[PDB]
Design a protein around this ligand. Structure first.
Ligand code: CHL
Ligand code: CLA
Ligand code: CLA
Ligand code: CLA
Ligand code: CLA
Ligand code: CLA
Ligand code: CLA
Ligand code: CLA
Ligand SMILES: CC1=C[C@H](O)CC(C)(C)[C@H]1/C=C/C(C)=C/C=C/C(C)=C/C=C/C=C(C)/C=C/C=C(C)/C=C/C1=C(C)C[C@H](O)CC1(C)C
Ligand SMILES: CC1=C(/C=C/C(C)=C/C=C/C(C)=C/C=C/C=C(C)/C=C/C=C(C)/C=C/C2=C(C)CCCC2(C)C)C(C)(C)CCC1
Ligand SMILES: CCCCCCCCCCCCO[C@@H]1O[C@H](CO)[C@@H](O[C@H]2O[C@H](CO)[C@@H](O)[C@H](O)[C@H]2O)[C@H](O)[C@H]1O
Lengths: 219, 84, 213, 227, 311, 39
């Protein structure tokens, strides 16, 4: 399908997994003599995790700038993503309730529970629905698939009632995630080149596409 | 820069390489030269598929692009070096 | 089935939930060998029970210092007692090693030979030094109220509370040392500062715990 | 079967429609354990009845005395005579003693249903207590239970759930605006676009602390807003 | 087909063999009867070929033994950087390199050995070193013991990674013989990646850190007031003041106007009169050329496409 | 763990530990009793 397809890839890329457009030029999903992290299960799961974080990031990095322009948020906020405090050298916001290292500790303890509990379900399917976790273990039974746990909370509105409908939604999740992962690379590449915001970059490219593009930015 | 000597040289160089491979005037991913400097059927392993009539895969473009870039760079800097 | 330290990870084989506070935590398999596990059981109980007395001693004397009752900080008490009371440090230390030495050596040989300290060799005392279980020397001297010899289920529950409260106190004493080293103040001075400003007065802003902060 | 919280959602197996106000809604699965569901239902009844009294208190007081701010009525200087500047400690003494009795009585009914359904003093005085959380008798002095109790239990839980949301609106609106719930409506109606959460949010109008008869009680808003 | 091929969980991670000396040999596993066994055990420890006739098993032992060596070398480097940050006179030598003698080993005062702590200068007493680390660190643009301490920690993180890699690629995911027999692929990566990328990356560090820092040092600027490497990496105006061509950015590179970068990419030759060493601008243009040459060389052998050569 | 302790009981390991102990003991003695030439 997509450019780069190879007879070699057609061996394992039979179109069962979401977003199988036949593109594995380096043969990473080949199940033969697979091991470590270079194996189908881990690599498909990692594409979805990267994709979901990238979809939230592509929106989070472009939201404040747009809303600030619309006047829906105070200018105090409306800061550039790289200037939020993730990279102090590039800038940092001093208006948070606490300092970044204090909030970062809160992040560590929160993520460790979220990540290590997500990991345990990939390692021991169904394990997070057994030991007591304040009654929440009822919603962490998961399914046989790590990337698609579903259940009372992760699939609150029970969307994807049929196998076909769920398959389509899984295709749309991977498509939007792959696009957002590419946008997040763009945001970083365009922040190093112009030192401006992604929204600003778009506004300039519309104000004058010729004098406002990568070839002009080089100078 | 557009239409400048450097730009024209670079465009022509890369274009010439792509064209040479596209028309069997150069080695390709499916055409390899013999010790006698010939051009026979190669056996690519990955075997990228190409709808192109001459089976010009993306790898062929990448190769020609590099070759042409190198050629253009050498010619441009070389002319600058020889004053021309 | 039994709650474990890392949910989802099977408990080690040498840990069968029989011991109090068994949450299958032995990542370096240090208690894999049984006899070694029995020794470490008494070790954790002895460390834990001292930590519980320590923590309760620091917390009370720290409260008395927080209020105006003239109780020295834990890290200054040793010098105050010796100075104010003109007590000879060497004498006190040697007396301690004499008393602890006697009690520890008798507990040691009970571990090596269970029940061997109930022969009457010590002033004719027999039953008060036989020992009920490893790390649990009941009798009428150590369990004067009989809580271990009445209601087996209550005894098991009390053992669970003892080990958990001892592990908490052991963590708290490591906290009292780390906080004093990092802040130079007392424990209840640290709690007042945090309570006053919990978002701006914590370890992340102490200038020591996170060097890049 | 019955109507649910959303179109297409499948009710949890433990939610079959026995309890009133059952829309099969347990996204976090906290009712899967029967013991937990019983306690949580009592907790929900408690939060519902208290919140309905709170919504009614803030509204009635606001109409009768529009000059008194609900968020700062607890201050003794704002107490109605002859309770103005009354020793707050002595007041808490009455509340702790009385509440502790009634709360441990209700609690023992949960531990052992029908174990405390009798006057501990004047023997013979007993409440019917048809269901846990529904004592009745002296507690139902007008006999409204002798009818469609289940349908009335639905109205109670539904009005209670709505009052629990409303009360938290009053609180958050009070914190962002500094006005009670009828004053806020008036300010909105006064200039809907001018006065709304879009502008009101971002500001905590509550001090950091207040001195009550000699004691500093720390005060916080529910979000990091300008304070 | 060149591809990643490995066996999963090939060897168990237990201490059972640790307690059985000579387990690797059919003759030595029987245990010692004479003292010759002890010598034979150590002499035949790393002779995998003699241990087993399986090439794949031998290849897996060689690969993991190399990760062990790389980990050893990293610990050695971390120690040198650590001793430069905690037991050296580097900061004083940076200010007075023509008189202060480099020293990075201090001896404890015992049995009278403290005499070995010579008066090297800079208010320091220690053993004079001749490894040339002080001059290497100055060339790299290091001006603080903090930078030496941070590199030491990095080297230990790298040493831990090397030892992990060794355990993982032998006990968890062991590469199969076919993997190791991909000589055409190995040469392409070692020439293009290890050598060419390594040279390109080093040119990056030299152009953005080594050249400005050393230019300021040679101008007489005190090491304390020199801009930190990141300040130079995040500010073009400072680099533009030191090298005017930086004001043009990377445009000249993509426009083939390389001549503009003549102020930092040079062919002076000879020696810097201030320091007596080669010009760093010459070393920068050199490593850039090496990088290009090796990137081309790494595209000569055939792998998974028809293009390339068969050795 | 038993195999690990057996490995720690191997000739070279015990020698390193025993010699480190003996060296340490002698060093500390000369650290607290420097220049000991006679009894
Ligand atoms: C059992 C644990 C224990 C710990 C952690 C400490 C800790 C301390 N003692 Mg202390 N002591 C301990 C037991 C005992 N002390 C004393 C008698 C004293 C005196 C007389 C003094 C201290 C002092 C001190 C403090 C000064 C640093 C020092 O010299 O530490 C030594 C101990 C350690 C470094 C580690 C202890 C074992 C782990 C310090 C916080 C000094 C003080 O208060 O300074 C203001 C002081 O003057 N202690 C006795 C009775 C003889 C003890 C046990 O029997
Ligand atoms: C000579 C060094 C060396 C070599 C030849 C290999 C070779 C291999 N490794 Mg391995 N590894 C190494 C070192 C090495 N490793 C080290 C030091 C570690 C510890 C960090 C690991 C940890 C490791 C794991 C956990 C796994 C492998 C796996 C593999 C196999 C396939 C995966 C792969 O490499 O694809 C290419 C690698 C990637 C696609 C990921 C790239 C991620 C890197 C870190 C990004 C940057 C790399 C670059 C060198 C960084 C330059 C500096 C930077 C500033 C730009 C393969 C045979 C996988 C396997 O077993 O497959 C069966 C696997 O699961 N390795
Ligand atoms: C229009 C075609 C053209 C022209 C006019 C030039 C002209 C020039 N080239 Mg050039 N070159 C070209 C194409 C061209 N090149 C192409 C297509 C490539 C491949 C991409 C190269 C790659 C190339 C390299 C790598 C170099 C040159 C160099 C040079 C300059 C001096 C060559 C010399 O005498 O070396 C020296 C003469 C010797 C006898 C030395 C022999 C080499 C070893 C050390 C012995 C010169 C002005 C050299 C240069 O840049 O000098 C400034 C040099 O480095 N060229
Ligand atoms: C004998 C001199 C003496 C003096 C002047 C004090 C003084 C003080 N103690 Mg006390 N204490 C003493 C002996 C003494 N103690 C002895 C022997 C014990 C062991 C039983 C204790 C155990 C103790 C505790 C547990 C506490 C204090 C506390 C306090 C402070 C609060 C008031 C109080 O007495 O609490 C009352 C506590 C008592 C034990 C009163 C009984 C002590 C009498 C005098 C027995 C003495 C017998 C002997 C023959 C004389 C106060 C400054 C409190 C504190 O630390 O504040 C933070 C605290 O809670 N002490
Ligand atoms: C706790 C981790 C661990 C454990 C339990 C094991 C266990 C085992 N490994 Mg192993 N391994 C590990 C980590 C581990 N390994 C790591 C991190 C690497 C990467 C280097 C390897 C690479 C490796 C290879 C290549 C092989 C094994 C083999 C084995 C098995 C028998 C050999 C043996 O261990 O005897 C014990 C051996 C030693 C104690 C020698 C220690 C070697 C160190 C690294 C040398 C240090 C020298 C020092 C730096 C300089 C000395 C200078 C002098 C002046 C003092 C055995 C079951 C062998 C096997 O599969 O059986 C045939 C095998 O060939 N391992
Ligand atoms: C860009 C690709 C690349 C790079 C950079 C390297 C680099 C290296 N390889 Mg190598 N290799 C590669 C591809 C690559 N390889 C491929 C595709 C194959 C299969 C044909 C092999 C098969 C192979 C074998 C059989 C061996 C090596 C070995 C080595 C090391 C030789 C020691 C040295 O001189 O360097 C100096 C050391 C350093 C500069 C330290 C930096 C090393 C870091 C980790 C760079 C990362 C390298 C790694 C390939 C990146 C992926 C890691 C990821 C899987 C986590 C070296 C670090 C030898 C070895 O045993 O190494 C353990 C060895 O025996 N490689
Ligand atoms: C490894 C070699 C190397 C490296 C790393 C660099 C790096 C750099 N050079 Mg440089 N340079 C080099 C070699 C190198 N150079 C060589 C060999 C030469 C000689 C020709 C030069 C000559 C040169 C000049 C003349 C200049 C630079 C400049 C720069 C800086 C700006 C680059 C730029 O403008 O945009 C480059 C575009 C990118 C780097 C793409 C960025 C992509 C980002 C990082 C990806 C992020 C993705 C991620 C998902 C985002 C999410 C983040 C997460 C928190 C969510 C930069 C730090 C300029 C400078 O100094 O600025 C002050 C400049 O003036 N260089
Ligand atoms: C047979 C050879 C020989 C002999 C007899 C000695 C004897 C002596 N050496 Mg010496 N030495 C030797 C070889 C020898 N050395 C060699 C080859 C070297 C080069 C490596 C050295 C390097 C050396 C140094 C650097 C020093 C000595 C010192 C000493 C003296 C310290 C005595 C001591 O430790 O206190 C007495 C120790 C004890 C009584 C403890 C006895 C051991 C156990 C614990 C006692 C148990 C008893 C039951 C001592 C008279 C020290 C000195 O000050 O010289 C005067 C000192 O500084 N030696
Ligand atoms: C397919 C294939 C096949 C063959 O075989 C081979 C090869 C080629 C290798 C393969 C692959 C390719 C590729 C392209 C890849 C890519 C990736 C990416 C880009 C990712 C991203 C990724 C990305 C991502 C995650 C992102 C993320 C983000 C986030 C979360 C967030 C962030 C943020 C926010 C909001 C805001 C603030 O202010 C800041 C921050 C904090 C910062
Ligand atoms: C006709 C036709 C077509 C078209 C196609 C095309 C358009 C092609 C082309 C393509 C291209 C457009 C290609 C190119 C490429 C290029 C490249 C790929 C480059 C690269 C570069 C490089 C590689 C460089 C290198 C180096 C450096 C960096 C340094 C120094 C110098 C050198 C050179 C060494 C179509 C599809 C429509 C279909 C129909 C028909
Ligand atoms: C190609 C990918 C691999 C190499 C990656 C190299 C970059 C890695 C990320 C860290 C460096 C980011 O790159 C950073 O971009 C900013 C953009 O304002 C540069 O800033 C520079 O250019 C901007 C304009 O764009 C000027 O306003 C600024 O005065 C000048 O210093 C920094 O000098 C550079 O250090």
């Amino acid at each position: 399908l997509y450019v780069g397809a190879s007879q070699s890839s057609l061996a394992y890329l039979d179109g069962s997994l979401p977003g199988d457009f036949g593109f594995d030029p380096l043969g990473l999903l080949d199940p033969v003599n697979s091991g470590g992290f270079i194996e189908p299960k881990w690599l498909q799961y990692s594409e979805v995790i990267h994709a979901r974080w990238a979809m939230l990031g592509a929106a989070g990095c472009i939201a404040p700038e747009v809303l600030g322009a619309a006047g829906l948020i105070p200018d105090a906020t409306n800061i550039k993503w790289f200037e939020s405090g993730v990279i102090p050298p590039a800038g940092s916001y001093n208006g948070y309730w606490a300092d970044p290292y204090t909030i970062f500790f809160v992040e560590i303890v929160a993520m460790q529970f979220a990540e290590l509990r997500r990991l345990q379900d990939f390692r021991y399917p169904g394990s997070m629905g057994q030991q007591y976790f304040l009654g929440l273990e009822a919603i962490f039974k998961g399914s046989g698939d790590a990337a698609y746990p579903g259940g009372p909370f992760f699939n609150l509105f029970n969307l994807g009632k049929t196998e076909a409908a769920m398959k389509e939604l899984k295709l749309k999740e991977i498509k939007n995630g792959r696009l957002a992962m590419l946008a997040m690379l763009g945001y970083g590449a365009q922040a190093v080149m112009t030192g401006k915001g992604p929204f600003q970059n778009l506004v300039e490219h519309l104000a004058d596409p010729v004098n406002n593009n990568i070839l002009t930015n080089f100078a | 820069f557009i239409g400048s000597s450097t730009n024209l040289i670079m465009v022509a160089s890369t274009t010439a390489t792509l064209a040479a491979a596209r028309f069997g005037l150069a080695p390709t991913v499916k055409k390899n030269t013999t010790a006698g400097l010939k051009l026979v059927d190669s056996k690519n392993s990955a075997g990228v598929i190409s709808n192109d009539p001459a089976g010009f895969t993306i790898v062929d473009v990448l190769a020609m692009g590099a070759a042409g870039h190198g050629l253009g760079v050498g010619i441009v800097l070389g002319l600058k070096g020889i004053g021309a | 089935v039994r709650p474990v330290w890392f949910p989802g990870n099977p408990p080690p084989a040498h840990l069968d939930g029989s011991l109090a506070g068994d949450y299958g935590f032995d990542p370096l398999f240090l208690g894999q060998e049984p006899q070694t596990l029995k020794w470490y059981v008494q070790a954790e109980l002895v460390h834990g029970r001292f930590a519980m007395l320590g923590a309760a001693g620091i917390i009370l004397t720290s409260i008395g210092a927080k209020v105006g009752l003239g109780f020295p900080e834990w890290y200054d008490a040793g010098k105050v007692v010796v100075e104010k009371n003109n007590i000879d440090f060497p004498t006190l230390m040697v007396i301690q090693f004499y008393l602890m030495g006697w009690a520890e050596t008798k507990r040691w040989y009970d571990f090596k030979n269970p029940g061997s300290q109930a022969d009457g060799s010590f002033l004719g005392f027999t039953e008060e030094f036989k020992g009920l279980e490893n790390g649990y020397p009941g009798g009428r001297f150590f369990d004067p109220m009989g809580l271990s010899r009445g209601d087996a289920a209550k005894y098991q529950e009390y053992k669970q509370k003892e080990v958990k409260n001892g592990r908490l106190a052991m963590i708290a004493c490591l906290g009292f040392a780390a906080q004093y080293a990092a802040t130079g103040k007392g424990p209840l001075d640290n709690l007042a500062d945090h309570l006053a400003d919990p978002n701006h007065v914590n370890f992340a802003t102490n200038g020591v715990s996170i060097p890049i902060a | 079967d019955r109507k649910l919280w959303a179109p297409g959602v499948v009710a949890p197996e433990y939610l079959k429609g026995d309890l009133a106000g059952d829309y099969g809604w347990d996204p976090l699965g906290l009712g899967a354990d029967p013991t937990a569901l019983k306690w949580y239902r009592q907790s929900e009844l408690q939060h519902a009845r208290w919140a309905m009294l709170g919504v009614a208190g803030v509204l009635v007081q606001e109409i009768v005395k529009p000059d008194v701010y609900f968020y700062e009525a607890g201050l003794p200087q704002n107490l109605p005579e002859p309770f103005t500047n009354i020793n707050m400690g002595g007041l808490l003494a009455w509340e702790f003693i009385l509440m502790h009795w009634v709360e441990v009585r209700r609690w023992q009914d949960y531990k052992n249903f029908g174990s405390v359904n009798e006057d501990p003093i004047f023997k013979g005085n007993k409440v019917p207590n048809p269901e846990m959380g529904y004592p009745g008798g002296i507690f139902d002095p007008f006999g409204f239970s002798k009818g469609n109790l289940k349908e009335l239990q639905t109205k109670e839980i539904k009005n209670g759930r709505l009052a629990m949301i409303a009360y938290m609106a009053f609180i958050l609106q009070a914190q962002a605006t500094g006005k009670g719930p009828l004053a806020a409506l008036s300010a909105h109606l006064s200039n809907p676009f001018g006065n709304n959460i879009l502008k009101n949010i971002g500001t905590c109008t509550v001090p950091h602390s207040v001195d009550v008869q000699g004691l500093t009680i720390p005060l916080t808003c529910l979000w990091p807003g300008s304070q | 087909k060149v591809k990643i091929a490995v066996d999963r969980n090939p060897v168990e991670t237990s201490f059972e063999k640790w307690a059985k000396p000579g387990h690797f040999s059919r003759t030595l596993s029987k245990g010692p009867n004479t003292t010759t066994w002890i010598w034979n055990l150590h002499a035949d420890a790393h002779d995998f070929d003699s241990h087993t006739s399986d090439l794949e098993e031998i290849s897996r032992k060689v690969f993991s033994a190399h990760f062990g060596q790389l980990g050893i070398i990293f610990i050695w480097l971390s120690g040198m950087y650590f001793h430069g940050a905690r037991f050296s006179n580097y900061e004083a030598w940076l200010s007075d390199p023509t008189h202060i003698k480099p020293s990075a080993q201090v001896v404890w005062p015992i049995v009278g050995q403290e005499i070995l702590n010579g008066d090297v200068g800079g208010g320091f007493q220690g053993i004079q070193i001749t490894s040339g680390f002080f001059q290497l660190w100055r060339a790299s643009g290091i001006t603080s013991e903090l930078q030496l301490y941070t590199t030491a920690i990095g080297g230990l993180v790298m040493a831990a990674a090397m030892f992990f890699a060794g355990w993982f690629h032998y006990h968890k995911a062991a590469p199969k013989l076919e993997w190791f027999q991909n000589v055409e692929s190995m040469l392409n990566h070692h020439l293009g990646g290890l050598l060419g990328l390594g040279s390109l990356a080093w040119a990056g560090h030299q152009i953005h850190v080594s050249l400005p820092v050393n230019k300021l040092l040679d101008a007489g600027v005190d090491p304390k007031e020199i801009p930190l490497p990141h300040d130079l990496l995040l500010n073009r105006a400072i680099m533009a003041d030191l090298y005017p061509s930086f004001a043009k950015g990377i445009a000249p590179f993509f426009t083939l106007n390389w001549s503009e970068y003549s102020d930092f990419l040079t062919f002076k030759g000879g020696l810097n009169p201030v320091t007596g060493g080669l010009w760093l601008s010459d070393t920068a243009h050199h490593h850039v050329a090496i990088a290009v040459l090796f990137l081309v060389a790494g595209h000569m052998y055939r792998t998974n496409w028809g293009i390339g050569h068969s050795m | 763990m038993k195999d690990f302790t057996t490995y720690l009981s191997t000739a070279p390991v015990i020698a390193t530990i025993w010699f480190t102990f003996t060296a340490g003991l002698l060093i500390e003695i000369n650290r607290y009793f420097p220049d000991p030439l006679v009894f």
